[PDB]
Amino acid sequence: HMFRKLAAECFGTFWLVFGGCGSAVLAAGFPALGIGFAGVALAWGLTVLTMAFAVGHISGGHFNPAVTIGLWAGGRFPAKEVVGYVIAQVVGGIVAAALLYLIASGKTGFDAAASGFASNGYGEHSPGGYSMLSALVVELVLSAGFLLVIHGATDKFAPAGFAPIAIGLALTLIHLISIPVTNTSVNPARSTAVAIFQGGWALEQLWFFWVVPIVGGIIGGLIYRTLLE
Amino acid sequence: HMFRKLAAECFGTFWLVFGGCGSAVLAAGFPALGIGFAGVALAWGLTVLTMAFAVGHISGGHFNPAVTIGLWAGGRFPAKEVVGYVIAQVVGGIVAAALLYLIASGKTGFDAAASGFASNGYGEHSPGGYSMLSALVVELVLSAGFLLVIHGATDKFAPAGFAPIAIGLALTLIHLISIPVTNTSVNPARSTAVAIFQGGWALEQLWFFWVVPIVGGIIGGLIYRTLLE
Amino acid sequence: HMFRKLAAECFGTFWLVFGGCGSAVLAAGFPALGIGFAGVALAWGLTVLTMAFAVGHISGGHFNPAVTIGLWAGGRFPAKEVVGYVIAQVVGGIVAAALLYLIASGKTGFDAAASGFASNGYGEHSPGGYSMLSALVVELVLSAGFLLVIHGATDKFAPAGFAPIAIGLALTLIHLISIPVTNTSVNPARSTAVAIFQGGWALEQLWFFWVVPIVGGIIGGLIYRTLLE
Amino acid sequence: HMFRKLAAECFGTFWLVFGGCGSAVLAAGFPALGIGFAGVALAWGLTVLTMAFAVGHISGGHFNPAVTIGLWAGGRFPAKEVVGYVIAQVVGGIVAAALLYLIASGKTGFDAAASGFASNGYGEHSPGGYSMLSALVVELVLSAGFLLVIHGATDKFAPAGFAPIAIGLALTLIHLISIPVTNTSVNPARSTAVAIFQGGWALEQLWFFWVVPIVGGIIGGLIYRTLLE
Ligand SMILES: CCCCCCCCO[C@@H]1O[C@H](CO)[C@@H](O)[C@H](O)[C@H]1O
Ligand SMILES: CCCCCCCCO[C@@H]1O[C@H](CO)[C@@H](O)[C@H](O)[C@H]1O
Ligand SMILES: CCCCCCCCO[C@@H]1O[C@H](CO)[C@@H](O)[C@H](O)[C@H]1O
Ligand SMILES: CCCCCCCCO[C@@H]1O[C@H](CO)[C@@H](O)[C@H](O)[C@H]1O
Ligand SMILES: CCCCCCCCO[C@@H]1O[C@H](CO)[C@@H](O)[C@H](O)[C@H]1O
Ligand SMILES: CCCCCCCCO[C@@H]1O[C@H](CO)[C@@H](O)[C@H](O)[C@H]1O
Ligand SMILES: CCCCCCCCO[C@@H]1O[C@H](CO)[C@@H](O)[C@H](O)[C@H]1O
Ligand SMILES: CCCCCCCCO[C@@H]1O[C@H](CO)[C@@H](O)[C@H](O)[C@H]1O
Ligand SMILES: CCCCCCCCO[C@@H]1O[C@H](CO)[C@@H](O)[C@H](O)[C@H]1O
Ligand SMILES: CCCCCCCCO[C@@H]1O[C@H](CO)[C@@H](O)[C@H](O)[C@H]1O
Ligand SMILES: CCCCCCCCO[C@@H]1O[C@H](CO)[C@@H](O)[C@H](O)[C@H]1O
Ligand SMILES: CCCCCCCCO[C@@H]1O[C@H](CO)[C@@H](O)[C@H](O)[C@H]1O
Question: Gene3D superfamilies this protein is in (chains A, B, C, D)?
Fold first, then answer.
């Protein structure tokens, strides 16, 4: 049933934004004991590992408009189901961002706009001061690579069952490399969710984190489909 | 035999409290080399991963009254076995908390009451100063999500064998997000165990960490059963 | 062939001491970027995960005299092969400790005696100042629990293939809890290897880390065999 | 088809250098939140875990001239395919190093030569001041051990599917031990890639990190083939 797959994609994407962004906003910078980028990166991949095992057998477990569209371009997913996944994914992420904003507001001094609310940005809004070109190349390469890993790990001849470990851990890796550059998107639903609550520059740069992750995912699906499969 | 399943749940829950709380009390804040929240979060999920692989095939490996009751509500576990699991779980956790208190007392300056002995709390007793509403929402969402992941990872059509990785790592993730908010419960046996030895406010707020994790687990079982399965 | 199993146990135990102790001596305290106890704990479990997958199908992959003897007591391993495993394990660990001492000496200021060379100790020689009773209880409980996890993860009805993940990660967990107490033994071959090169108090307390890990392993094998299996 | 296997080895090795070196150059030392050696070590192993699951079923997933040649020496891979793998691997790594250098240049003050651009070195160029002998022994032992783990984890009687976890995590472990000594090579393609852009001493010491990782891999393949298999 399409409706359960959509529900799976919705809950899945909530889990991803709530855990990934949640761990950044609530836990990364906690004084002395905070989890850092490494811990945020771990949380990211675990959201996908845990939900891909929980609901992958229902929707395919994309939880990411760049995954859905890259699987489309890779010949693994039908055109007709794409938009519904992307919508489910966005809604899921917004609901998680909203519950997170509520949780974060329960601590004195919380300020979504000034902290950035874990939004992805480049230039002045890159966590490490990286240029827009730096942001483009990193997001493109890692979106491509994420898709190449998803395609291959779910290949016919790939050992059955492990895809959720491969894919989720691939997202940890992605974050271990790129947080300093863009705060790591590779996911338009993820960038949209928190940008809405950040409410300023995150909305002005949001288009970047629709365009680049998607193109990158497309490229990754094409590489697998035409050169590897 | 019910007796071995109870024993499995008892040893399992001891392993969870001893490792999870043990790593927090003995190792989180160790000067210069201590493991932080990220390391506590890792320990948490590994207690469940390791025991779910060790004794999951005996009891189902709940190790958590919110898991048992959420599996009940999800239609995966019988009413008649619930109370015995919960009792086993509580006893297991108390024995671990007691052996831990003994281990911790062997270091000059240990003080269960003043340190909090890894107890879950909100408000004044949240590690990060988060309100009661912040604590409710986080514990509710993550208890629900823990149950959704348990249900899905053990679904008929979920690949056999991986559930312990999915579930245990889901608990790491849960801790990576919420330690700052409540010290992370999602488990009434876990909160009760150490609150007894903390012996003050942890006992006054303990009811919260029975009610919220259970309701949350219930909701998660209901979501899976009615919308996903 | 017994000879290959011994060789597997020997190489295995070298891998464990070289990686576990190696990461502590070379990397834990590296200024600013060092890996801490959490990273040492991760290295520990990965030595066992990686070798249990590499040579578990040859020897059973014990790499630990407390594992061999606890599997004996659990009815999973024959008396007649025990001593040969323990010998293989000790030799393996000593060779790793020797190559490590050589590697560590290649940096100005290295001093095995004064640093402790990653040796296990209690009292004055506990990393965190914990008493002998604290050391006994922690080592006993965690040795028992390690054995309970090994027995269960390799149970007939335990899903085939995952034991190396369960067991190796159980050792990470063990280290996440107890490094501050004893530097974490649960392994007489591991304690002997480096105590020889530390060459002072580590040799005076070594008996503790033969007796306690073994008794603990025995207890864990007995718990599984009589109450769980 | 040889061409796809080469492409798999090429993309694979790019993924390894881009993630491993990428995480070091972009994220290790990030102020306050940076990922450290432990996080770099995790990234390393995840590059191999993720690509071995994605393309292992295509090429065998070596991503490392020391792996290819050690599998040769172990009797697991034909002489005639070796050079093509090594070439693919080197090209892959250089392309990743180039895209990384471009990403890193987008931040004020980046200087590949002075930072070392994550190059492997010994002596004056060891991160921790370790001698050349220290560097030889560590790289030899860990290259050998990496190969022993690869051989065993892919043995006939090794449980099917887990090799990518065993091998990838073995690389994390390798890095947890040796970064301080050499920045961890065990991979000539990895050392060559960044040495080209470092452009000074990294090129003068590069031969070391061809010779030692290869000899070590050879030894590891020989140990398995003659003593364990
Ligand atoms: C699915 C929801 C996507 C939301 C995209 C909306 C883009 C908003 O656009 C932004 O609006 C803000 C006005 O409040 C301003 O801060 C910015 O100048 C403007 O670019
Ligand atoms: C699927 C639902 C969301 C679709 C993509 C949202 C793209 C938002 O794009 C944003 O639009 C603004 C225009 O108002 C511009 O001012 C911003 O610069 C741009 O980031
Ligand atoms: C899917 C979301 C829209 C993607 C359209 C691709 C081209 C967008 O192009 C960009 O739009 C920005 C404002 O939106 C401007 O600030 C940039 O100058 C413009 O280059
Ligand atoms: C299964 C065991 C559950 C124990 C729940 C008992 C609740 C105790 O209640 C508490 O008792 C303390 C008196 O010692 C006081 O600190 C508190 O004011 C009181 O709320
Ligand atoms: C299964 C065994 C334990 C059941 C749940 C214990 C709930 C304890 O609840 C506690 O009770 C006290 C009443 O004395 C109150 O004062 C505290 O505020 C409350 O946290
Ligand atoms: C299972 C444990 C009891 C849960 C009962 C749900 C309602 C409890 O309600 C709460 O009890 C606390 C004291 O116990 C009071 O401090 C709070 O004001 C009260 O709201
Ligand atoms: C398998 C190898 C086990 C070695 C155990 C030997 C116990 C050594 O015993 C120790 O010897 C040292 C003398 O050099 C002294 O530092 C100590 O006082 C003494 O207890
Ligand atoms: C299997 C090979 C090693 C067997 C166990 C070694 C036990 C060493 O035991 C050591 O012996 C010394 C006696 O000289 C005592 O002085 C020390 O206190 C004690 O730690
Ligand atoms: C297997 C290694 C020997 C274990 C024997 C168990 C009893 C050892 O007993 C201990 O031996 C130590 C010196 O060895 C003394 O310092 C202690 O006082 C003594 O209690
Ligand atoms: C596959 C590509 C391998 C490149 C190996 C080339 C070895 C370069 O050699 C180096 O060249 C530099 C001149 O630019 C100098 O810094 C060094 O003195 C010299 O050793
Ligand atoms: C497969 C393509 C690369 C082959 C190995 C490159 C080995 C480079 O070796 C380098 O060569 C230089 C000679 O110019 C010496 O000066 C350096 O000391 C040495 O590191
Ligand atoms: C595959 C790359 C070449 C390996 C050849 C093995 C012997 C190299 O030998 C070394 O070469 C270096 C310059 O290249 C010199 O600095 C050293 O003194 C020399 O020992």
Answer: Glycerol uptake facilitator protein (1.20.1080.10)
